[PDB]
Structure formats: C-alpha cells, structure tokens
C-alpha cells in the first residue's frame with residue numbers, strides 16, 4: 148500500500164526549520180509574498196538539488212567530500228564549504244535548544260510565567276493581552292516581555308554584550324552534554340521506538356493547529372498568511388529568505404544528504420523518496436504556518452494592533468506565538484511541557500545528525516591521527532567543547548543580535564546559494580546532466596523526466612545567480628526586528644561567516660592546480676575527469692561510459 152512506504156522512510160524530515168524558522172521568515176518578509184518565491188524555489192531548485200545530492204551519494208557511495216572527488220576532482224572544495232557551513236550551523240543551532248530547555252524548565256510550575264505580567268522582570272508599561280482592548284502611550288504583551296526581559300535580557304545592541312546569562316549557559320551546556328553523550332555512546336537519533344519520535348511532532352502540531360484555527364482572530368491571520376503582496380516581491384531579500392529556507396529545511400548543501408544517500412542500495416528508487424520526503428517536509432512547513440499565523444491573527448485583534456506589528460520579526464516568533472497558544476488551552480502547563488519537549492526532541496534529532504555528520508567527515512578527512520578509539524573519543528569532546536564556547540557568545544545579553552548574524556549569514560543567504568549553484572553547475576554542465584541520467588536510469592530502473600535535467604542546467608543556476616546579483620544591487624543591510632541597524636563591523640563579521648565557506652570552492656581550485664604538475668591547460672583537463680565514480684561490484688553497475 149502507501150502507509151508502509153511512509154513507514155519505511157520514517158518521519159525525520161520534520162525539524163526546527165519547519166516549526167521555528169519558516170514562520171518568522173514568512174512573518175518578517177511580509178505575509179504571503181514569502182510563498183511565491185518559496186514554491187518557485189521549492190519546485191525549481193529545492194527538490195532538484197535535494198535529489199541530486201541523494202543520487203550523488205548513492206551513485207558514488209561516498210561521504211560529503213570524497214563523493215565530489217569521485218565526480219570531479221576540481222571543484223572538490225564543495226565538501227569543505229559544506230563542512231564549514233555545518234560547523235557554523237552546529238554552533239548556532241543548539242542555542243534554539245537552549246531556549247527551548249529554558250522554557251521547558253520554566254513551564255514546571257503552577258502558573259505559566261508568561262501568562263500574566265506582574266513579575267520582577269516586567270516593565271511597568273506591560274498590560275495583559277485581554278485588557279489592552281477590553282478597556283501609557285504604548286503597552287507591551289507579557290509574552291514578548293518574558294522573551295526579551297527574562298529569556299534573552301535583550302541589550303541595546305551587539306556592541307553591548309553585557310554579562311553572561313548563567314541560566315541560559317547551563318541550558319546550553321545540558322544540551323551539549325546530551326549531544327556529546329549520545330554521539331559518544333552511539334545512541335540512535337530516534338530513542339527506542341521510532342513511533343513516538345515521529346508521531347508526537349505531528350500530534351502536537353495538529354493540536355496546536357486545531358487550537359489556532361478556532362481562535363476568534365484566526366481569519367484575519369490566514370489572509371495575512373496567504374494573500375500575497377506584490378510590492379514586497381520587488382525586494383530581493385524575500386527571494387533570498389525563501390530560497391535558502393528551502394535549503395535550510397532540506398539540509399542540503401550541508402553534506403548530510405550525500406551521506407544519507409550513501410546508505411541507499413545501488414538499485415533503489417530514491418527518486419520516489421526525495422519527492423515524498425520533500426513534499427512532506429515542505430508540506431509540514433506550510434501547514435504549521437496555518438497554526439502560528441492564526442495565533443498572530445488572534446493576538447493582533449486582541450491587542451488592537453496590526454498583524455505585521457504584533458510579535459517579533461526575527462527568531463523567537465515561535466517563542467512568542469506558540470507559548471501564547473498554550474495559554475488558551477485547558478491545562479496550560481500540561482501543553483506547555485509537551486510543546487517544548489517536542490521542540491526539543493525535533494532539534495536534538497537534527498543536531499545529533501549534523502554533529503555526528505561533521506565529526507565523521509572530520510575524522511575521515513585527517514585519518515591516522517583521529518583513529519577510532521581513544522583519539523576519536525577525545526575528538527568527540529573537542530568538537531563539542533569548541534562549539535560550546537563559540538556558542539556562548541549568543542547566550543550573553545547582547546546574544547540575540549549575534550544569533551541573527553549567524554542565522555542570516557553562516558548557514559543561509561549567499562553561502563547556501565553559492566554551494567547550491569556549484570553543485571548543480573558541476574553536475575549539469577561539467578559532468579553532464581544527460582550523463583547522470585544514464586547512471587540514474589541504471590539505479591532506479593527508469594530514466595526520469597526532463598524536470599531534473601533542466602533544473603540543474605538552467606533553473607537553479609539562474610535562481611542562484613539572479614538572486615545573488617540582485618541582492619547586491621539592491622543591498623539592504625541586515626536588521627534585527629526591523630528597527631535595529633547593525634554596525635558596519637557586525638556586517639563585516641557576518642559577511643566573514645558566509646565568506647569563510649564560500650572561499651573554500653575557489654581556494655581548493657587554487658590548491659589543486661598548484662599540486663598538479665604540467666601545462667596549465669593539461670592541468671585543468673586532468674582535474675575535471677571523474678575518477679570512476681560508480682566503482683562498486685556489490686551490485687550490478689554499468690561502467691560510466
């Protein structure tokens with residue numbers, strides 16, 4: 148039937164990129180103006196690049212870096228770029244789990260701390276959400292106060308880091324020990340039975356979706372979600388945000404999907420899996436958007452303010468709307484605990500894969516010194532310890548601004564488009580898209596349609612180059628919560644996080660050419676020839692030519 152096929156592919160597609168990052172990227176970039184670039188990218192590059200990575204991993208049966216060595220010795224810096232991207236992503240991704248852990252620990256009390264505002268941390272300007280319109284120039288929602296006063300202690304700027312938050316630093320330490328202990332002991336990402344690890348994220352999202360839609364203001368919230376704003380499409384930032392949100396959700400350009408495709412058998416219809424997971428992954432983001440944007444629609448009409456100015460246009464929208472929804476539910480504390488466990492399990496499974504993914508790449512990159520045993524176990528703690536210390540810069544009071552620097556630059560924006568363009572450019576134009584079909588038709592049993600070939604050759608490079616060029620032409624500097632202007636050095640620092648991964652592709656080209664000996668034209672020709680990528684006798688494999 149069809150349920151067994153869904154069971155075989157599990158439910159690991161859902162992550163924090165769906166229930167945390169998508170809603171606020173949609174919220175920041177107007178309303179439904181985010182969806183047109185979202186779907187254009189999803190059907191032009193999103194699914195094609197995802198399937199390309201899977202099928203390259205399956206064809207070469209190699210990891211992130213060695214697969215590119217098999218496909219094309221030149222442009223092999225894509226693996227190193229992916230390693231840098233995933234390292235920065237692991238540095239800034241565990242902070243979300245730190246916030247989730249803090250919220251979960253704060254939810255273990257009789258009265259939710261964000262339900263009412265009469266506490267110590269609360270500005271006198273705060274007023275209850277119900278009484279803002281029921282009955283002093285501006286008032287603040289208790290939910291937003293708790294987020295920027297208790298959880299983040301927001302400082303005036305990034306240049307004022309302030310004293311470290313010892314409560315978040317421990318919550319950051321706990322999730323790193325969990326990542327360290329699980330990876331060191333070889334614990335699977337899904338604990339025990341996979342049913343609870345996969346059905347629970349959907350069950351909680353359905354409950355939140357049901358709660359959101361029945362709220363009185365949900366009608367105006369969805370009209371904000373769905374109906375687009377064309378004048379927003381003039382801005383080239385919405386295309387970048389929507390384009391790389393697909394890449395972030397699919398975990399492509401990270402080297403994760405190549406390794407995921409490696410475990411697939413040679414004769415395996417991975418084409419169906421990429422389409423099925425891709426639609427389910429992007430489908431969850433669309434459906435989860437209905438839940439959160441209904442809450443904002445309810446929040447905006449309750450406070451008598453616009454939907455576009457009711458919450459934070461930045462990370463933590465899922466920490467303002469969702470904790471607000473659980474306040475309007477029977478047994479609010481019970482649902483608050485479950486939500487932040489789900490929000491924590493989703494992130495932990497994603498973090499388990501990437502931290503182990505980059506470590507596996509790192510140890511295999513420099514063997515004879517990181518050999519399996521005492522040396523590797525120390526390396527497991529070394530990667531986490533350094534990633535913990537660098538992650539401490541986003542825990543200070545001015546740590547939200549540093550988090551937005553990493554989020555907008557380190558593993559999103561031009562750095563993800565740079566790799567996605569170069570993965571498609573090498574396969575479609577250098578290796579040959581028609582050549583890959585001969586490999587694919589031998590693998591999945593039938594030659595696919597012209598969609599995949601024409602998406603690597605044309606659609607993805609034009610989308611990545613076009614968005615890259617037009618982002619620089621109409622350059623608007625990064626801003627946090629649409630009111631804070633970053634200092635020049637912060638953007639220069641942020642551009643370095645992107646540029647650190649982007650420079651791997653040209654730098655390895657320079658290294659490779661100088662390593663090779665001979666005339667320059669002979670040198671470039673030698674490094675563009677694949678080194679027998681389909682070299683496996685375990686299954687029936689036709690020679691590349």
Ligand SMILES: *[C@@H]1O[C@H](CO)[C@@H](O)[C@H](O)[C@H]1NC(C)=O
Nearest residue numbers: 284285286287451452453456
């Ligand atoms: C106060 O609320 C008004 C009306 O929504 C808004 O125009 C203004 O920017 C707010 N000012 C502050 C300080 O939040």
Ligand SMILES: CCCCCCCCCCCC
Nearest residue numbers: 186187190191597598601602
């Ligand atoms: C908005 C959806 C974009 C889908 C792109 C599909 C490309 C197919 C090209 C086939 C040409 C023969």
Ligand SMILES: CCCCCCCCCCCC
Nearest residue numbers: 305306307308537540549640
């Ligand atoms: C003047 C003090 C500025 C402090 C800004 C902190 C930025 C942290 C960057 C972390 C790079 C990995």
Ligand SMILES: CCCCCCCCCCCC
Nearest residue numbers: 227231647648651654655658
């Ligand atoms: C700028 C920080 C990451 C730089 C990575 C460079 C990798 C070069 C490896 C060359 C191997 C032949």
Ligand SMILES: CCCCCCCCCC
Nearest residue numbers: 227230231234235512647
């Ligand atoms: C985040 C910068 C360091 C990440 C390591 C990249 C790979 C180095 C070995 C070639």
Ligand SMILES: CCCCCCCCCC
Nearest residue numbers: 360361365366369434437
């Ligand atoms: C007031 C009811 C709004 C319903 C919106 C359309 C259904 C979305 C289901 C995901």
Ligand SMILES: CCCCCCCCCC
Nearest residue numbers: 309311536537539540543
């Ligand atoms: C007072 C701010 C403390 C920030 C600590 C940052 C540690 C970075 C280690 C590389």
Ligand SMILES: CCCCCCCCCC
Nearest residue numbers: 221576577578671672675
């Ligand atoms: C550096 C990449 C140049 C690609 C030129 C077109 C393909 C050449 C090999 C057939």
Ligand SMILES: CCCCCCCCCC
Nearest residue numbers: 635636637638639640643
């Ligand atoms: C615009 C100049 C920026 C200089 C300070 C930031 C550099 C970060 C990498 C060391």
Ligand SMILES: CCCCCCCC
Nearest residue numbers: 354357358361476477
């Ligand atoms: C007025 C309808 C209440 C709905 C509560 C939703 C709990 C799952």
Ligand SMILES: CCCCCCCC
Nearest residue numbers: 234235238530533534
């Ligand atoms: C953010 C980088 C952490 C260190 C990774 C290990 C380098 C060999």
Ligand SMILES: CCCCCCCC
Nearest residue numbers: 190191596597598599
């Ligand atoms: C669902 C609309 C876009 C379909 C793209 C072509 C798939 C073969």
Ligand SMILES: CCCCCCCC
Nearest residue numbers: 619635636638639642
């Ligand atoms: C390639 C564009 C770099 C822009 C850096 C701006 C630093 C002020």
Ligand SMILES: CCCCCCCC
Nearest residue numbers: 306636637639640643
């Ligand atoms: C005035 C320069 C501040 C630099 C902060 C650290 C950047 C890595």
Ligand SMILES: [Cl-]
Nearest residue numbers: 169392396432
């Ligand atoms: Cl998504």
